[PDB]
Amino acid sequence: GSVYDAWFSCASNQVAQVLLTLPYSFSQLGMMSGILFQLFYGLMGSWTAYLISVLYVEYRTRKERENHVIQWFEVLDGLLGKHWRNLGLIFNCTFLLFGSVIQLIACASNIYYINDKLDKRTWTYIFGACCATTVFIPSFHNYRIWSFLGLAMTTYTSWYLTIASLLHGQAEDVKHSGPTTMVLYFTGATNILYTFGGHAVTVEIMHAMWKPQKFKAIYLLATIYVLTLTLPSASAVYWAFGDKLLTHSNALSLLPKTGFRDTAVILMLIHQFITFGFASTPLYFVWEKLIGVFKRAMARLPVVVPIWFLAIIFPFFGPINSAVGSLLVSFTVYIIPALAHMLTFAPAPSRENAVERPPRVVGGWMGTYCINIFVVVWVFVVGFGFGGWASMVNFVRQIDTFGLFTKCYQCP
Ligand SMILES: O=C(O)COc1ccc(Cl)cc1Cl
Protein backbone atom coordinates (compact mmCIF):
# COMPACT_ATOMS: atom_id res chain seq x y z
CA GLY A 1 0.00 0.00 0.00
CA SER A 2 3.01 2.27 0.41
CA VAL A 3 4.58 4.30 -2.39
CA TYR A 4 6.98 1.48 -3.29
CA ASP A 5 4.14 -1.03 -3.70
CA ALA A 6 2.27 1.31 -6.05
CA TRP A 7 5.44 1.99 -8.03
CA PHE A 8 6.09 -1.74 -8.42
CA SER A 9 2.50 -2.41 -9.47
CA CYS A 10 2.30 0.39 -12.05
CA ALA A 11 5.78 -0.42 -13.38
CA SER A 12 5.15 -4.16 -13.81
CA ASN A 13 1.71 -3.54 -15.35
CA GLN A 14 3.09 -1.18 -18.01
CA VAL A 15 4.51 -3.94 -20.24
CA ALA A 16 3.55 -7.62 -20.06
CA GLN A 17 3.82 -9.10 -23.56
CA VAL A 18 4.30 -6.07 -25.84
CA LEU A 19 7.98 -6.18 -24.87
CA LEU A 20 8.43 -9.01 -27.38
CA THR A 21 6.61 -7.28 -30.26
CA LEU A 22 8.40 -3.93 -29.86
CA PRO A 23 11.31 -4.96 -32.14
CA TYR A 24 8.69 -5.93 -34.73
CA SER A 25 7.37 -2.36 -34.58
CA PHE A 26 10.93 -1.02 -34.83
CA SER A 27 11.32 -3.13 -37.98
CA GLN A 28 8.62 -0.89 -39.48
CA LEU A 29 9.50 2.50 -37.96
CA GLY A 30 13.29 2.46 -37.61
CA MET A 31 15.73 3.68 -34.99
CA MET A 32 15.09 7.43 -34.73
CA SER A 33 11.35 7.18 -35.37
CA GLY A 34 10.95 4.29 -32.95
CA ILE A 35 12.84 6.00 -30.14
CA LEU A 36 11.01 9.30 -30.66
CA PHE A 37 7.61 7.57 -30.68
CA GLN A 38 8.48 5.59 -27.55
CA LEU A 39 9.52 8.73 -25.66
CA PHE A 40 6.52 10.75 -26.85
CA TYR A 41 4.00 8.04 -25.99
CA GLY A 42 5.65 7.46 -22.61
CA LEU A 43 5.20 11.15 -21.86
CA MET A 44 1.59 10.93 -23.06
CA GLY A 45 0.94 7.89 -20.88
CA SER A 46 2.39 9.64 -17.84
CA TRP A 47 0.25 12.71 -18.54
CA THR A 48 -2.92 10.63 -18.88
CA ALA A 49 -2.05 8.76 -15.68
CA TYR A 50 -1.79 12.13 -13.94
CA LEU A 51 -5.16 13.15 -15.40
CA ILE A 52 -6.79 9.95 -14.14
CA SER A 53 -5.14 10.48 -10.75
CA VAL A 54 -6.49 14.01 -10.37
CA LEU A 55 -9.95 12.90 -11.52
CA TYR A 56 -9.97 10.03 -9.02
CA VAL A 57 -8.73 12.28 -6.20
CA GLU A 58 -11.46 14.83 -6.94
CA TYR A 59 -14.13 12.12 -7.04
CA ARG A 60 -12.95 10.53 -3.79
CA THR A 61 -12.81 13.90 -2.02
CA ARG A 62 -16.31 14.80 -3.20
CA LYS A 63 -17.64 11.42 -2.08
CA GLU A 64 -15.96 11.77 1.32
CA ARG A 65 -17.37 15.27 1.81
CA GLU A 66 -20.83 13.67 2.11
CA ASN A 67 -15.28 -0.62 2.05
CA HIS A 68 -15.43 -1.10 -1.72
CA VAL A 69 -13.22 -0.73 -4.81
CA ILE A 70 -13.44 2.45 -6.88
CA GLN A 71 -13.45 1.80 -10.63
CA TRP A 72 -12.99 4.15 -13.56
CA PHE A 73 -16.65 4.12 -14.62
CA GLU A 74 -17.69 4.92 -11.05
CA VAL A 75 -15.34 7.92 -11.07
CA LEU A 76 -16.80 9.09 -14.38
CA ASP A 77 -20.32 8.76 -12.95
CA GLY A 78 -19.34 10.73 -9.86
CA LEU A 79 -17.67 13.53 -11.82
CA LEU A 80 -20.10 13.71 -14.77
CA GLY A 81 -23.41 12.36 -16.06
CA LYS A 82 -24.53 8.78 -16.53
CA HIS A 83 -23.83 8.76 -20.27
CA TRP A 84 -20.16 9.32 -19.45
CA ARG A 85 -20.33 6.32 -17.12
CA ASN A 86 -21.87 4.17 -19.85
CA LEU A 87 -19.26 5.22 -22.41
CA GLY A 88 -16.36 4.66 -20.04
CA LEU A 89 -17.67 1.30 -18.86
CA ILE A 90 -18.26 0.03 -22.39
CA PHE A 91 -14.87 1.15 -23.68
CA ASN A 92 -12.98 -0.11 -20.62
CA CYS A 93 -14.69 -3.51 -20.71
CA THR A 94 -14.08 -3.96 -24.43
CA PHE A 95 -10.44 -2.92 -24.07
CA LEU A 96 -9.92 -5.30 -21.15
CA LEU A 97 -11.54 -8.16 -23.07
CA PHE A 98 -9.28 -7.60 -26.07
CA GLY A 99 -6.26 -7.18 -23.81
CA SER A 100 -6.99 -10.53 -22.19
CA VAL A 101 -7.26 -12.03 -25.68
CA ILE A 102 -3.88 -10.49 -26.53
CA GLN A 103 -2.27 -11.89 -23.38
CA LEU A 104 -3.63 -15.37 -24.15
CA ILE A 105 -2.31 -15.18 -27.72
CA ALA A 106 1.07 -14.08 -26.37
CA CYS A 107 1.08 -16.98 -23.90
CA ALA A 108 0.40 -19.46 -26.70
CA SER A 109 3.09 -17.93 -28.91
CA ASN A 110 5.67 -17.97 -26.12
CA ILE A 111 4.93 -21.54 -25.03
CA TYR A 112 5.23 -22.65 -28.65
CA TYR A 113 8.94 -21.73 -28.65
CA ILE A 114 9.98 -24.11 -25.84
CA ASN A 115 7.96 -27.12 -27.13
CA ASP A 116 7.68 -27.03 -30.92
CA LYS A 117 6.00 -30.45 -31.23
CA LEU A 118 2.57 -28.85 -30.75
CA ASP A 119 1.46 -26.08 -33.10
CA LYS A 120 0.43 -22.72 -31.68
CA ARG A 121 -3.29 -23.50 -32.01
CA THR A 122 -3.16 -26.56 -29.75
CA TRP A 123 -1.14 -24.47 -27.31
CA THR A 124 -3.89 -21.84 -27.46
CA TYR A 125 -6.43 -24.58 -26.70
CA ILE A 126 -4.51 -25.87 -23.69
CA PHE A 127 -3.72 -22.39 -22.35
CA GLY A 128 -7.34 -21.30 -22.69
CA ALA A 129 -8.38 -24.41 -20.78
CA CYS A 130 -5.79 -23.65 -18.09
CA CYS A 131 -6.70 -19.95 -17.80
CA ALA A 132 -10.38 -20.88 -17.53
CA THR A 133 -9.43 -21.67 -13.92
CA THR A 134 -9.04 -17.91 -13.39
CA VAL A 135 -12.81 -17.80 -12.84
CA PHE A 136 -12.32 -19.67 -9.56
CA ILE A 137 -10.16 -16.96 -7.98
CA PRO A 138 -12.42 -14.43 -6.18
CA SER A 139 -10.48 -11.32 -7.24
CA PHE A 140 -6.93 -11.04 -8.58
CA HIS A 141 -6.89 -7.55 -7.08
CA ASN A 142 -5.46 -7.18 -3.55
CA TYR A 143 -2.95 -9.85 -4.63
CA ARG A 144 -0.81 -7.27 -6.46
CA ILE A 145 1.67 -7.33 -3.57
CA TRP A 146 3.55 -9.89 -5.69
CA SER A 147 4.16 -7.35 -8.47
CA PHE A 148 7.89 -7.02 -7.79
CA LEU A 149 8.09 -10.58 -9.11
CA GLY A 150 6.55 -9.60 -12.44
CA LEU A 151 8.74 -6.51 -12.61
CA ALA A 152 11.78 -8.75 -12.13
CA MET A 153 10.59 -11.03 -14.94
CA THR A 154 10.07 -8.07 -17.27
CA THR A 155 13.46 -6.49 -16.55
CA TYR A 156 15.26 -9.83 -16.86
CA THR A 157 13.57 -10.52 -20.20
CA SER A 158 14.43 -7.05 -21.52
CA TRP A 159 18.08 -7.27 -20.47
CA TYR A 160 18.35 -10.81 -21.84
CA LEU A 161 16.99 -9.60 -25.17
CA THR A 162 19.50 -6.74 -25.22
CA ILE A 163 22.48 -8.94 -24.30
CA ALA A 164 21.58 -11.77 -26.69
CA SER A 165 21.03 -9.33 -29.55
CA LEU A 166 24.35 -7.60 -28.90
CA LEU A 167 26.20 -10.93 -28.68
CA HIS A 168 24.59 -12.30 -31.84
CA GLY A 169 25.76 -9.33 -33.89
CA GLN A 170 24.71 -8.81 -37.50
CA ALA A 171 24.84 -11.13 -40.49
CA GLU A 172 25.99 -10.11 -43.96
CA ASP A 173 22.37 -10.29 -45.18
CA VAL A 174 21.03 -7.89 -42.53
CA LYS A 175 19.33 -4.91 -44.18
CA HIS A 176 17.64 -2.08 -42.27
CA SER A 177 15.06 -1.13 -44.88
CA GLY A 178 13.44 1.43 -42.58
CA PRO A 179 10.06 3.05 -43.23
CA THR A 180 9.21 1.16 -46.41
CA THR A 181 5.55 2.22 -46.50
CA MET A 182 3.08 4.33 -44.55
CA VAL A 183 0.94 1.35 -43.50
CA LEU A 184 3.76 -0.38 -41.62
CA TYR A 185 4.94 2.91 -40.12
CA PHE A 186 1.50 3.66 -38.70
CA THR A 187 1.08 0.08 -37.48
CA GLY A 188 4.34 0.43 -35.56
CA ALA A 189 3.27 3.81 -34.20
CA THR A 190 -0.01 2.28 -33.01
CA ASN A 191 1.86 -0.60 -31.37
CA ILE A 192 4.08 1.87 -29.50
CA LEU A 193 0.92 3.74 -28.50
CA TYR A 194 -0.50 0.51 -27.09
CA THR A 195 2.73 -0.21 -25.22
CA PHE A 196 2.08 2.77 -22.91
CA GLY A 197 -0.88 4.34 -21.14
CA GLY A 198 -1.56 2.33 -18.00
CA HIS A 199 -4.29 0.20 -19.61
CA ALA A 200 -7.31 1.71 -17.81
CA VAL A 201 -6.39 -0.08 -14.56
CA THR A 202 -4.45 2.83 -13.06
CA VAL A 203 -7.34 3.66 -10.72
CA GLU A 204 -7.40 0.07 -9.45
CA ILE A 205 -3.76 0.25 -8.33
CA MET A 206 -4.13 3.82 -7.08
CA HIS A 207 -7.01 2.80 -4.80
CA ALA A 208 -4.73 0.63 -2.67
CA MET A 209 -2.49 3.59 -1.83
CA TRP A 210 -2.96 5.25 1.55
CA LYS A 211 -2.48 8.69 -0.05
CA PRO A 212 -3.31 8.54 -3.78
CA GLN A 213 -2.47 12.25 -4.13
CA LYS A 214 1.18 11.36 -4.89
CA PHE A 215 0.56 8.97 -7.80
CA LYS A 216 1.90 11.42 -10.40
CA ALA A 217 5.58 11.08 -9.49
CA ILE A 218 5.23 7.34 -8.87
CA TYR A 219 3.80 6.78 -12.34
CA LEU A 220 6.40 9.07 -13.90
CA LEU A 221 9.20 7.02 -12.32
CA ALA A 222 7.51 3.76 -13.32
CA THR A 223 7.19 4.87 -16.94
CA ILE A 224 10.75 6.21 -17.10
CA TYR A 225 12.00 2.85 -15.81
CA VAL A 226 9.77 1.05 -18.32
CA LEU A 227 11.29 3.21 -21.06
CA THR A 228 14.79 2.40 -19.80
CA LEU A 229 13.82 -1.26 -20.19
CA THR A 230 12.04 -1.00 -23.55
CA LEU A 231 14.45 1.24 -25.45
CA PRO A 232 17.60 -0.91 -25.08
CA SER A 233 15.96 -4.27 -25.80
CA ALA A 234 14.06 -3.13 -28.89
CA SER A 235 16.97 -1.00 -30.10
CA ALA A 236 19.46 -3.87 -29.81
CA VAL A 237 17.12 -6.41 -31.40
CA TYR A 238 16.38 -4.15 -34.36
CA TRP A 239 19.98 -3.03 -34.89
CA ALA A 240 21.14 -6.65 -34.80
CA PHE A 241 18.47 -8.31 -36.93
CA GLY A 242 16.99 -5.74 -39.33
CA ASP A 243 14.10 -6.20 -41.75
CA LYS A 244 13.88 -9.92 -40.91
CA LEU A 245 11.70 -8.95 -37.93
CA LEU A 246 8.73 -8.30 -40.23
CA THR A 247 8.39 -12.03 -40.94
CA HIS A 248 8.84 -12.79 -37.21
CA SER A 249 6.77 -10.59 -34.91
CA ASN A 250 7.91 -12.43 -31.77
CA ALA A 251 11.50 -11.48 -30.93
CA LEU A 252 12.27 -14.77 -29.17
CA SER A 253 11.58 -16.68 -32.40
CA LEU A 254 14.65 -15.31 -34.17
CA LEU A 255 17.03 -15.60 -31.21
CA PRO A 256 18.96 -18.87 -30.80
CA LYS A 257 17.43 -21.49 -28.52
CA THR A 258 19.34 -21.74 -25.23
CA GLY A 259 18.72 -22.09 -21.51
CA PHE A 260 18.46 -18.32 -21.16
CA ARG A 261 15.78 -18.21 -23.86
CA ASP A 262 13.84 -21.00 -22.14
CA THR A 263 13.99 -19.19 -18.79
CA ALA A 264 12.86 -15.95 -20.45
CA VAL A 265 9.97 -17.75 -22.15
CA ILE A 266 8.83 -19.38 -18.90
CA LEU A 267 9.05 -16.10 -16.98
CA MET A 268 7.16 -14.24 -19.71
CA LEU A 269 4.49 -16.95 -19.66
CA ILE A 270 4.08 -16.59 -15.89
CA HIS A 271 3.91 -12.80 -16.17
CA GLN A 272 1.37 -12.98 -19.00
CA PHE A 273 -0.81 -15.39 -17.01
CA ILE A 274 -0.75 -13.02 -14.03
CA THR A 275 -1.52 -10.04 -16.28
CA PHE A 276 -4.37 -11.94 -17.93
CA GLY A 277 -5.85 -12.65 -14.52
CA PHE A 278 -5.50 -9.00 -13.50
CA ALA A 279 -7.09 -7.74 -16.72
CA SER A 280 -9.90 -10.31 -16.64
CA THR A 281 -10.93 -9.75 -13.02
CA PRO A 282 -12.66 -6.40 -13.78
CA LEU A 283 -14.58 -8.13 -16.58
CA TYR A 284 -15.75 -10.72 -14.06
CA PHE A 285 -16.80 -7.91 -11.72
CA VAL A 286 -18.79 -6.16 -14.44
CA TRP A 287 -20.42 -9.42 -15.55
CA GLU A 288 -21.38 -10.19 -11.95
CA LYS A 289 -22.89 -6.71 -11.59
CA LEU A 290 -24.86 -7.05 -14.83
CA ILE A 291 -26.13 -10.58 -14.11
CA GLY A 292 -27.05 -9.76 -10.50
CA VAL A 293 -24.72 -12.32 -8.90
CA PHE A 294 -18.66 -21.04 -5.30
CA LYS A 295 -21.44 -20.35 -7.80
CA ARG A 296 -19.42 -17.46 -9.25
CA ALA A 297 -17.18 -19.97 -11.06
CA MET A 298 -19.91 -20.92 -13.54
CA ALA A 299 -21.32 -17.38 -13.73
CA ARG A 300 -17.94 -16.19 -15.05
CA LEU A 301 -17.59 -19.10 -17.50
CA PRO A 302 -19.39 -17.26 -20.35
CA VAL A 303 -17.01 -14.34 -19.81
CA VAL A 304 -13.99 -16.39 -20.94
CA VAL A 305 -15.78 -17.91 -23.95
CA PRO A 306 -15.41 -14.74 -26.09
CA ILE A 307 -11.73 -14.58 -25.13
CA TRP A 308 -11.14 -18.19 -26.17
CA PHE A 309 -12.91 -17.76 -29.51
CA LEU A 310 -11.04 -14.55 -30.36
CA ALA A 311 -7.62 -16.05 -29.58
CA ILE A 312 -8.17 -19.04 -31.88
CA ILE A 313 -9.81 -17.12 -34.73
CA PHE A 314 -7.25 -14.27 -34.63
CA PRO A 315 -3.97 -15.63 -33.22
CA PHE A 316 -1.98 -12.83 -34.88
CA PHE A 317 0.58 -11.82 -32.27
CA GLY A 318 1.71 -8.53 -33.79
CA PRO A 319 -1.18 -7.07 -35.79
CA ILE A 320 -3.71 -7.63 -33.00
CA ASN A 321 -1.68 -5.37 -30.72
CA SER A 322 -1.95 -2.51 -33.22
CA ALA A 323 -5.63 -3.19 -33.89
CA VAL A 324 -6.50 -3.01 -30.19
CA GLY A 325 -4.19 -0.03 -29.67
CA SER A 326 -5.93 2.00 -32.37
CA LEU A 327 -9.57 0.95 -32.02
CA LEU A 328 -9.86 0.68 -28.22
CA VAL A 329 -6.81 2.01 -26.35
CA SER A 330 -6.83 5.29 -28.27
CA PHE A 331 -10.28 5.98 -26.76
CA THR A 332 -9.93 4.14 -23.43
CA VAL A 333 -6.53 5.29 -22.13
CA TYR A 334 -5.75 8.47 -24.10
CA ILE A 335 -8.91 10.34 -25.16
CA ILE A 336 -11.62 9.55 -22.60
CA PRO A 337 -9.55 10.53 -19.51
CA ALA A 338 -8.48 13.80 -21.15
CA LEU A 339 -12.02 14.66 -22.23
CA ALA A 340 -13.34 13.87 -18.74
CA HIS A 341 -10.67 16.06 -17.15
CA MET A 342 -11.48 18.92 -19.52
CA LEU A 343 -15.23 18.65 -18.96
CA THR A 344 -15.26 18.24 -15.17
CA PHE A 345 -13.13 21.35 -14.58
CA ALA A 346 -14.63 23.39 -17.44
CA PRO A 347 -17.10 25.21 -15.13
CA ALA A 348 -15.49 28.04 -13.20
CA PRO A 349 -16.85 26.90 -9.79
CA SER A 350 -15.30 23.45 -10.28
CA ARG A 351 -11.98 24.90 -11.46
CA GLU A 352 -11.68 27.33 -8.54
CA ASN A 353 -12.60 24.73 -5.89
CA ALA A 354 -10.34 22.03 -7.36
CA VAL A 355 -8.95 19.74 -4.67
CA GLU A 356 -5.48 19.72 -6.25
CA ARG A 357 -4.14 22.61 -8.31
CA PRO A 358 -2.48 21.97 -11.69
CA PRO A 359 1.32 21.67 -11.75
CA ARG A 360 3.08 25.03 -11.71
CA VAL A 361 5.66 24.06 -14.35
CA VAL A 362 2.97 23.17 -16.90
CA GLY A 363 1.35 26.59 -16.58
CA GLY A 364 -1.78 26.01 -14.54
CA TRP A 365 -5.24 25.48 -15.97
CA MET A 366 -4.37 27.02 -19.35
CA GLY A 367 -1.39 24.72 -19.82
CA THR A 368 -3.32 21.67 -18.65
CA TYR A 369 -6.15 22.42 -21.09
CA CYS A 370 -3.71 22.99 -23.95
CA ILE A 371 -1.97 19.68 -23.25
CA ASN A 372 -5.33 17.91 -23.04
CA ILE A 373 -6.39 19.34 -26.41
CA PHE A 374 -3.07 18.30 -27.93
CA VAL A 375 -3.41 14.77 -26.52
CA VAL A 376 -6.97 14.40 -27.82
CA VAL A 377 -6.14 15.74 -31.29
CA TRP A 378 -2.97 13.68 -31.67
CA VAL A 379 -4.55 10.42 -30.50
CA PHE A 380 -7.59 11.01 -32.72
CA VAL A 381 -5.57 11.86 -35.84
CA VAL A 382 -2.60 9.47 -35.58
CA GLY A 383 -3.92 7.06 -32.96
CA PHE A 384 -7.36 6.46 -34.48
CA GLY A 385 -7.65 7.70 -38.06
CA PHE A 386 -4.30 6.96 -39.70
CA GLY A 387 -3.23 4.49 -37.03
CA GLY A 388 -6.57 2.71 -37.09
CA TRP A 389 -6.72 2.54 -40.88
CA ALA A 390 -3.15 1.24 -41.14
CA SER A 391 -3.67 -1.33 -38.39
CA MET A 392 -6.92 -2.61 -39.89
CA VAL A 393 -5.55 -2.82 -43.44
CA ASN A 394 -2.57 -4.73 -42.04
CA PHE A 395 -4.95 -7.00 -40.13
CA VAL A 396 -6.99 -7.83 -43.24
CA ARG A 397 -3.77 -8.39 -45.19
CA GLN A 398 -2.64 -10.87 -42.54
CA ILE A 399 -6.07 -12.53 -42.64
CA ASP A 400 -5.76 -12.97 -46.41
CA THR A 401 -2.16 -14.21 -46.18
CA PHE A 402 -2.26 -16.66 -43.26
CA GLY A 403 -6.00 -17.35 -43.56
CA LEU A 404 -8.59 -17.71 -40.83
CA PHE A 405 -8.06 -19.99 -37.84
CA THR A 406 -4.43 -20.18 -38.94
CA LYS A 407 -2.29 -22.95 -37.47
CA CYS A 408 1.16 -22.11 -36.08
CA TYR A 409 0.93 -18.48 -37.16
CA GLN A 410 4.41 -17.55 -38.40
CA CYS A 411 5.93 -21.00 -37.90
CA PRO A 412 8.60 -21.16 -40.65
O1 LIG B 1 0.80 -6.12 -23.04
C2 LIG B 1 0.60 -4.90 -22.77
O3 LIG B 1 1.23 -4.01 -23.40
C4 LIG B 1 -0.41 -4.52 -21.70
O5 LIG B 1 -1.25 -5.60 -21.43
C6 LIG B 1 -2.17 -5.37 -20.40
C7 LIG B 1 -1.76 -5.50 -19.08
C8 LIG B 1 -2.65 -5.28 -18.05
C9 LIG B 1 -3.96 -4.93 -18.33
CL10 LIG B 1 -5.11 -4.65 -17.00
C11 LIG B 1 -4.37 -4.81 -19.65
C12 LIG B 1 -3.48 -5.03 -20.68
CL13 LIG B 1 -4.02 -4.86 -22.37
DSSP codes, 253-272: HHSPP-HHHHHHHHHHHHHH
Q: What is the number of other CB atoms lying within 10 angstroms of the CB of residue 116?
A: 11
Q: Give me ligand 1 centre to Cα 254, in Å.
A: 24
CA nearest neighbour of 93 among 290, 309, 270? 290
Cβ–Cβ under 8 Å, residues 220 and 9: no
Specify the amino acid at residue 150: G
Pick the atom of ligand 1 nearest to 329's CA: 13
Ligand 1, atom 13: closest residue by C-alpha: 99
Pick the atom of ligand 1 nearest to 201's CA: 10
Q: Give me ligand 1 centre to Cα 13, in Å.
A: 7
Q: Give me ligand 1 centre to Cα 151, in Å.
A: 14
Q: Give me ligand 1 centre to Cα 33, in Å.
A: 23
Pick the atom of ligand 1 nearest to 200's CA: 10
Ligand 1, atom 12: closest residue by C-alpha: 99
- Quick check: CB of 41 below 6 Å from ligand 1? no
- How far, in Å, CA of 105 to CA of 128, rounded? 9
Contacts of 225 by beta carbon, 8 Å cutoff, 6+ apart: 11
Burial class (CB in 10 A: 0-12, 13-18, 19+), 136: exposed
Counting ligand 1 atoms within 8 A of each CB, the residue from 10, 13, 229, 310 with the most, and so the one to mutate, is 13
CATH level 3 topology of 3-402: Amino acid/polyamine transporter I (1.20.1740)
- Quick check: CB of 13 below 6 Å from ligand 1? yes
Solved how? cryo-EM
- Quick check: CB of 15 below 6 Å from ligand 1? yes
Burial class (CB in 10 A: 0-12, 13-18, 19+), 172: exposed
Burial class (CB in 10 A: 0-12, 13-18, 19+), 299: middle
Per-residue CA distances from 281 to 83, 271, 381 (Å): 24, 15, 32
- Quick check: CB of 324 below 6 Å from ligand 1? no
- Quick check: CB of 331 below 6 Å from ligand 1? no
Contacts of 183 by beta carbon, 8 Å cutoff, 6+ apart: 390, 393, 394
Q: Give me ligand 1 centre to Cα 62, in Å.
A: 30
The HSE-up count of residue 402 (CA atoms within 13 Å, CB side) is 20
| Residues 357-395 as b or e (16 or more Cβ within 10 Å = b) | ebeeeeeeeeebbebbeebbebbbebbbebbbebbbebb
- Quick check: CB of 17 below 6 Å from ligand 1? yes
Q: Give me ligand 1 centre to Cα 365, in Å.
A: 31
Integer Rg of the chain from CA: 21
Cβ–Cβ under 8 Å, residues 150 and 274: yes
- How far, in Å, CA of 103 to CA of 116, rounded? 20
- Quick check: CB of 275 below 6 Å from ligand 1? yes
Q: Give me ligand 1 centre to Cα 98, in Å.
A: 9
Q: Give me ligand 1 centre to Cα 172, in Å.
A: 37
Per-residue CA distances from 346 to 349, 366, 398 (Å): 9, 11, 44
